[PDB]
């Protein structure tokens with residue numbers, strides 16, 4: 537029914553540490569005023585397509601803007617993220633409070649078992665299974681917990697490129713059976729697993745030039761796809777598949793290694809038969 541997306545404004549946003557390669561050399565290189573403008577434009581674009589809910593940002597946790605990593609939602613349930621890095625672990629109580637205040641039933645992993653939420657685990661849009669990344673942030677051993685808690689098949693995919701350290705930076709299930717992804721971010725076995733399930737006519741394969749601009753980090757609502765700047769080649773492939781592309785600049789967030797999809801969490805994920 538209704539589609540609702542959770543975002544968190546950049547009131548306290550900065551690059552203060554280095555926990556992925558995009559952040560290297562970028563400490564205090566973000567413009568907070570430009571980040572506000574970019575986030576506001578993204579917020580407006582998303583709000584034209586879905587309801588947007590907000591969680592108040594916490595000072596001292598600049599990556600809280602990246603709500604995709606708050607947890608993994610299905611129905612009335614959420615698996616709360618347990619961050620790999622101490623630099624984001626302080627976001628956990630704030631996200632937990634939002635989920636509890638908004639009526640979700642929260643599952644929590646053991647403190648020593650990292651898992652970084654929808655940013656690292658994305659449902660097939662027909663609900664057939666959950667694609668779950670591992671290799672840099674989420675632990676493979678977390679996947680059976682998610683499978684049981686959410687009663688879903690989990691298809692584990694191994695990330696091999698430190699630039700593409702969250703599943704959502706290189707992999708984006710879309711409506712209509714389509715999958716937008718960057719194959720070199722995955723090992724050979726994981727590519728074979730993807731290929732077994734998604735036939736060639738449903739694959740929208742990005743090249744490295746688009747991948748490094750976070751083309752796969754896209755927000756898809758129905759036939760609309762929202763992302764950072766991408767090539768005309770990719771835009772034409774998406775248009776041929778039936779999608780309406782909306783671009784909005786996110787350079788200040790790429791300095792932290794995230795883009796449009798990372799700045800969002802779809803909190804209405806229906807359970808489908």
Ligand SMILES: NCCC[C@H](N)C(=O)O
Nearest residue numbers: 556602655792793794798
């Ligand atoms: N999904 C984007 C998260 C970006 C953040 N700086 C991190 O390294 O977790």
